[PDB]
Amino acid sequence: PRHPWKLSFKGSFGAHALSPRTLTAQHLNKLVSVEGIVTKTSLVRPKLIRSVHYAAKTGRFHYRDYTDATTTLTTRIPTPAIYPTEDTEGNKLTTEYGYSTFIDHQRITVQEMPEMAPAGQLPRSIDVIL
């Protein structure tokens, strides 16, 4: 008959089925399943992935790709590529929304469920990026 395929996981996690209170730093850099209650749900914001620009003098379409530490599991060199307001030859670039790509981004706060939270102590929470 282009987007890369992602993965999702189900099944028993054993010692990785945890709680926001139970999460410590020994579980860092590990795949964990966390049961809780959502308290904060931030605004869904678009994140620029590739920006497409037009040079009217040469009549050409350029592009630039952007990345951060959130989208990748393996850390690489942080290379901050600025937004190109001009090309190599010095011509002015006009940005082309609609041809640029934006990926929806949200962050939620998962707090431990009050049913299995301690009845007097303050609850613990974590941030999840979707």
Which stretches of the chain bind another protein, using CB under 8 A?
A: 48, 51, 66, 75, 77-88, 90, 92-95, 97, 100
89 or 115: CB nearest another protein: 89
16 or 50: CB nearest another protein: 50
Closest among 105, 112, 114, 113 to 126, alpha carbons compared: 112
Q: How far is the CB of 72 from another protein (least distance, A)?
A: 13
Contacts for 16-24: CB closer than 8 Å, 24+ residues apart:
19/112, 19/116, 19/124, 20/110, 20/111, 20/112, 20/123, 20/124, 20/125, 20/126, 21/112, 21/117, 21/123, 21/124, 23/124, 23/126
Q: How far is the CB of 92 from another protein (least distance, A)?
A: 7
Q: How far is the CB of 70 from another protein (least distance, A)?
A: 14
26 or 121: CB nearest another protein: 26
